[PDB]
Each structure stands twice: as structure tokens, then as C-alpha cells.
Design a protein around this ligand. Sequence first.
Ligand SMILES: NC(=O)C1=CN([C@@H]2O[C@H](COP(=O)(O)OP(=O)(O)OC[C@H]3O[C@@H](n4cnc5c(N)ncnc54)[C@H](O)[C@@H]3O)[C@@H](O)[C@H]2O)C=CC1
Ligand SMILES: NC(=O)C1=CN([C@@H]2O[C@H](COP(=O)(O)OP(=O)(O)OC[C@H]3O[C@@H](n4cnc5c(N)ncnc54)[C@H](O)[C@@H]3O)[C@@H](O)[C@H]2O)C=CC1
Ligand SMILES: O=CNC1CCCCC1
Ligand SMILES: O=CNC1CCCCC1
Ligand SMILES: [Zn+2]
Ligand SMILES: [Zn+2]
Ligand SMILES: [Zn+2]
Ligand SMILES: [Zn+2]
Lengths: 374, 374
Amino acid sequence: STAGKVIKCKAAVLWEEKKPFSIEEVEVAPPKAHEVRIKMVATGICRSDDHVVSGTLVTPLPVIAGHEAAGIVESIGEGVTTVRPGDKVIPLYTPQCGKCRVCKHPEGNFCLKNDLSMPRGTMQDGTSRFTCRGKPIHHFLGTSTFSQYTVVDEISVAKIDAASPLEKVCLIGCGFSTGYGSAVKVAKVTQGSTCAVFGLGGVGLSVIMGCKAAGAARIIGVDINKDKFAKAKEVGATECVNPQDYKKPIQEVLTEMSNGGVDFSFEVIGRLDTMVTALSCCQEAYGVSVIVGVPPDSQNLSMNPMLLLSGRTWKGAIFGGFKSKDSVPKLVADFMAKKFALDPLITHVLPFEKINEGFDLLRSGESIRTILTF
Amino acid sequence: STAGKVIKCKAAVLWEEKKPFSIEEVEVAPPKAHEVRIKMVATGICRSDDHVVSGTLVTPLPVIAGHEAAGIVESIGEGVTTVRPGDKVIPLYTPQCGKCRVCKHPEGNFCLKNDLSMPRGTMQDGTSRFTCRGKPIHHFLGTSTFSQYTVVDEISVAKIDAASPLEKVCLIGCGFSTGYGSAVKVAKVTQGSTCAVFGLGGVGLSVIMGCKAAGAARIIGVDINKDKFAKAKEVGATECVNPQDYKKPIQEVLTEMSNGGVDFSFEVIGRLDTMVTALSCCQEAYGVSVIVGVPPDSQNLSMNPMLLLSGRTWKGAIFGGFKSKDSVPKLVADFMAKKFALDPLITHVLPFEKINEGFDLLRSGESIRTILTF
Ligand SMILES: NC(=O)C1=CN([C@@H]2O[C@H](COP(=O)(O)OP(=O)(O)OC[C@H]3O[C@@H](n4cnc5c(N)ncnc54)[C@H](O)[C@@H]3O)[C@@H](O)[C@H]2O)C=CC1
Ligand SMILES: NC(=O)C1=CN([C@@H]2O[C@H](COP(=O)(O)OP(=O)(O)OC[C@H]3O[C@@H](n4cnc5c(N)ncnc54)[C@H](O)[C@@H]3O)[C@@H](O)[C@H]2O)C=CC1
Ligand SMILES: O=CNC1CCCCC1
Ligand SMILES: O=CNC1CCCCC1
Ligand SMILES: [Zn+2]
Ligand SMILES: [Zn+2]
Ligand SMILES: [Zn+2]
Ligand SMILES: [Zn+2]
């Protein structure tokens, strides 16, 4: 009934930076070979989407943003073998082509087909499937989930359990998996260790969940918004500290609290200064610090390399280090078996048409994750 | 005829920066409780010693430098249990107290009793055993090996094989162990991998030795002095490149040669720009870069944190990550079992009285390691 045809539907178009999204009609082309067109069911509001609005994260405009979502396949293009119409699916903003040197590496997950390093805002073939007012619109990280329908390349979608609650497991498309994996896969937090988590939004709360799952003895949450502390403690923090409360830099405070520095630290905000602070507060000889937050475009941090020469390890990761298409269905299955919880992250629910109120909630500090329903 | 008495002997005193060493008589006090007085037999000239002369490395002056050495115990103070008069020993510029959180950690080696982070230039008790022309002289990293006799704390000395050739195994006191361990212990180079080594002096050649022992398939040496390339290939480099030969930045050159970035890179020079270059030339999703070189005092580097967010790991280490008193006797035993070679590092052997000529050889680019014999 819609297969092979252009679909007219509503989407949230961003025409320029620092402006509200425009809810209006777009035209969605049918999928070409090895492409999948998806009817969206739920999408979360992640800070990275707000980074597109603010210019923190540069990608070509005008654009349909959104990358944390779940939906149901409407149709598939020629040659698609891994999903079928009617399947529940999660779009993958980090693809898994399975053929490049990173996909073949046992640890790597930043597939070389990604649209992050040199953003084009297109499908893999360099073209767009979206038109609005007769104008071509860019894609975002090959997903573009702020739309009733999107088209993604096959390497950018994973089939998930047919009984999955899509208004919850959309968070496995970004925020939960990023935070959880950053702790259990990237840092490899050890039982009995002391952890420090900078930033207690959706992703930082998920880092805390991973630290707790790994058996950390102490998990210190750090945020300048003390309203975030209650939920952080609910999901596993053993203390929370507000840097604004202290007359000393918080790296000094955390070093004292940990009797010489923490075992594992995580930057989950997106500021150059807290990236250096988080590295400094881990123990100088054997500490590990993981960058998760997204820095402002093209800006360099400044740091003393003696912080590394003493023995520290510094690393970062996209999507918690998970190979995306392998890991997303397994994470959904684990959620179905109650191995981790997603309800603590969901503070607000709104219809898709109220997307701008959802971003207002994020910017005011009141929300963790708002889930939008189509 | 010297136990319990002050010893008058020859040492090389550095009275101020950017001056030749002054070879003259000093007074060496007898060892106090848990101290060891050593008759030096051989000491190598390491670039870190030259860093003290040049002001790159700040430590209190005037000083008896030298930290890469081997000798024979002349006497021990009360309470010493790990060495005896007559023992062959190697001083440890990174102590191993066995009691701090770092010594008890399975990975850490930067013992909290070190004199590197906040240099005092004294014994552990805060005083000096050296006098010259009436004046107290500072120690260097708890070793001070540019002297016919030195006094060290028990936690800064290791007993080694009584049959050890000290004119060779003095290099296990710094240069060899640092480079070798940086490859095999800190980076954990894997079989079949591609490595890039920036800097082909004594430490860089030992990094190559470790990469080869770990089974690397490709080892690219990088140096602006092409005279270093012959020896680098002899000990395992498969290719050598001189950045001055290229119009493009060498991180771009190395990324092309490795078809997308190397598995492991090592900065073994001590320049801020080459630490950032070495990080950039390793593969963005799974590469590992190790800082070995000593940066100029109090200078910060500048880098883009997206280099880490994509998946790179950045780390540094002192003394190759080796727990010093545990590892040095085992490395000596490994050398005696012919498991690695030290002669490729030794280009010059001079009497101690020619220390300044040995430093001229290093600064001119002509030497790798000069061994000074007492
Ligand atoms: N590496 C990856 O793959 C991913 C990176 N991100 C990035 O992670 C970061 C966090 O994302 P969300 O949790 O959704 O954002 P969020 O905005 O909900 O949480 C950020 C938290 O940091 C706090 N904060 C802000 N400035 C602070 C400061 N100077 N000191 C201490 N705390 C401060 C805020 O009060 C807030 O609670 C963002 O930068 C996001 O773009 C998000 C998902 C994937
Ligand atoms: N982390 C640790 O525990 C230790 C650190 N070090 C430091 O390692 C570094 C190397 O030590 P050595 O091998 O003894 O010194 P070295 O002076 O013999 O070797 C340094 C090499 O770097 C080359 N080089 C200089 N500038 C260069 C540039 N822009 N690009 C490419 N190559 C360049 C030089 O030609 C030279 O061959 C020093 O900074 C030393 O202080 C030394 C031992 C222990
Ligand atoms: O939040 C989802 N994706 C992010 C990952 C880090 C770079 C910016 C985009
Ligand atoms: O070369 C020997 N020791 C070095 C170790 C790194 C800091 C300067 C001193
Ligand atoms: Zn996200
Ligand atoms: Zn791939
Ligand atoms: Zn040295
Ligand atoms: Zn110790």
C-alpha cells in the first residue's frame, strides 16, 4: 500500500542553528538497494541532538536530527537480508558494515562507514531520501529519527525482539548502551574499585549502572545540578558532590576522598575542562579515565603530559564501544530478562508534536530522558 | 677499610644548569638505618641526565646526577635485609617500597616514595649524604650514580646475579627496561601488529626490541637523524622514515603507510608536538599510543579530544611499567639466559673521567649509549 511509493509524513526539520524545530510535512523516498524504510514508534531526546541545534556538534543543515529510537520496518529495498517488513528495529548511528578493518578488529566498533568523522548528512550512497518544501534535507548519522518515517542503510539497522516495548528500548539506541558500555566494556571497571562519574544525565546514570553491575565499591557522582543527585543514588552512586560547593578544584577533592585518586573516572558532560579534571582525579600510576562527552566543534584542550607519564590511561569511545549490530539485539534481550532497568532514565513522555517542549525540558535541567511517541 | 667512615672519592658534580660536569673530590657519608653504600662499577649516559643539565628536567641543584648504573655493595646500614657487602646491585630510580597502594596494585609501578613528582633531591629521610668543597650536594632520583660511591635507600636498590657483567647490565637500570617494558608490558604489543617508534636512541631501540619480541609484523622507526636508521633496522625495524624528507605531516604519512593508522605508537623523544603526532598516527578506533619521552618542564600540549572519543587509548609510563625491585633481578637473569641483547645499544665505552666527552657524543647525535667505567 505504501511499498515502492513516496511517503508524505511529518518530521521535525531543523532549518538553522539555535531555532526551534519545525514540525511540517516531508517527502520520504522509497528505499533503494540495501536500504530499509522504518515507521518510527518512539525516539528519545539525547543531548547530542541538542548539540546539533547549538552548533556544538557540526553536521550539514537543514537536517532531520534524532538518532536514539525504535520503530517497525515498513519496506525493504532490493537485496536486504537482515530485516523484513513488520520487524521491530533500532537504527544504529554507528554502523556495522562487518567488512572494514575496524569491524574485523576484536575491540573496535567505530566502523569506517560512519558519518561522524567527516559528516556528509547523506545515506551511504551520498544522496538524501528527504524533501521538504521541494528542498533536499540532510540526514543525521545515517538515522534521522525525528520523523514519522526514515530510510536507513542496512548496515545501520538491527532487528530486535518482536515483543520489545519500543517506548523503552529506544534508549538502547544510544544513551543506555553508551553509558553502560563505557563502564563495562571500555573502562572494564573491576570489582571493589572506586569510580567517579562526571555528569548525571541519561548517559551518566547509565555509566553508574555499569559501574554497579561491575561491582564497584564506591561510585562518586559529580554534577553542578544537585537536583540530579537523588536519581544517581537510586541507580548506584554512594555519594554525590557538587563542584560549586567546594573552595578547591574538584580533582583535589576527589583525590582526597579516594585516598590518592580513583580507579576509574568518566567524563560524561562534554567540556574540555572536565575532560582534564576527570583524567587528573584518577590515580596517577594505574588510574583509567574515559571520555564520553562530546566536545565543542574543533576546540583543543590543554594538558600536562606528565599526567600520562606517571602511568595513567586515557581513552574515549563512541556508543560504549559496542559493535552496534551485534550488540543491540543482545542488549534488548538482556533488558527483556530484567538484567538492567530503563525506567529510571525516563522522566517525561510527550507526543512527537511537542518535541520543542521536550528540548525545553532538557535545557532547563528538569529532564533526564523525554521519550517522544509518534 | 671504609665501613662506618666517611669516604672521600671522585664524583661528577653539576653546580648549575648548562655547564660541564665538574670532576672533583666529594665526601660520601656512611649509610644510616636501611641505607646502602655502593661502589660504582659502570654507569650509562641517559638523555634524562642531559635533561637536568639543559633545564628540561627540574631537580634541585647542585646535584650528583646519574641513575643508570651497576655496582658492588661496600656497606649496609642497620636493618638492611635485602643486600649484603660484596653483592652486585643496580640502583632503582623508581623505588619499590612494597607497602604503598601503588606497590600493592598488580599493574602500578610508580611507587609513592619516588622523588620524581615533587623532586627533593635527598635521601628518604630528607637529608643528603654528599658534601663537596664544604657544601651539601643533592641526590638525583634517590640514585646519584655519577660518583665512585653513592648511598641509596634500601627500597631503591636490587641485588642481581653475582656473575653479571656490570658494564652491560647497567642498562637494565634504565634505558633497556624502559623501552622494552613500554612495548611488552605497557602497550602489550600483539603478534602481527604494526608499530611506529618515534625516536631511535637507546630507549627507542629498546622499544623496537620489545615490539620484535612481541611478534610485530611491521616496526616503523621515525627519526630526524637518518644516521640512526642502520642500527634501528639491525634490532628489528622494518622501515625508517625521516619527517624532514616529507612535505606532509608525518602522522599523515604513517597513516597512509599503515593503510589507516598503526596498531601501536611510541613517543620516545620528549617533544609535545611528537606526542600529539604519535597519538594521531595510531588507528582512530583501536590504536594505542604510549608516551615515553620526558616533556620540557611545566609545558602543556594541545590536542583535539575527538582523537580519543573515536576509540584511541593514550597512556604513559615510568621505567617501562616494571615494578622495579621485583623486575630488575629477573631482567638480569633473562639477559644471562640470552633472551635479549644489550650490545646493540652500546656504541662507546669510556673511563668515568671522560663524562663530559660522553655527553658531547650524545648531544652531537653520534652515540646511542656511552658506558662510563670507574
Ligand atoms: N561518546 C558517545 O557515543 C556519546 C556521547 N554523548 C554525549 O555525552 C554527554 C552527556 O549526554 P546526556 O547524558 O544525554 O546529557 P545531559 O545534558 O542530560 O547530562 C549532562 C550533565 O552534565 C551536568 N553538567 C553540565 N556542566 C557541568 C559541569 N561543569 N560540571 C559538572 N557537571 C556538569 C549537567 O548538569 C547534566 O546533568 C553529551 O555531551 C553527549 O553529547 C551522548 C551519547 C553518545
Ligand atoms: N619514561 C621513562 O621512564 C624514561 C624516559 N626517558 C626519556 O626518553 C627519551 C629518549 O631517551 P634516549 O633514548 O636516552 O634519548 P636520545 O637522545 O638518545 O634519543 C632521542 C632521539 O630522538 C631523535 N629526535 C629528536 N627530535 C626529533 C624529532 N622532532 N623528530 C623525530 N626524532 C627526533 C633524536 O635524533 C634521537 O635519536 C628522553 O626524553 C628521555 O628523557 C628515558 C628513560 C626513562
Ligand atoms: O549521541 C549520539 N552520538 C554521538 C556520539 C559522539 C559524537 C557525537 C554523536
Ligand atoms: O630516565 C630516567 N628517569 C626519567 C623518568 C621520566 C621522568 C624523568 C626521569
Ligand atoms: Zn545520543
Ligand atoms: Zn565497518
Ligand atoms: Zn634514564
Ligand atoms: Zn611503594
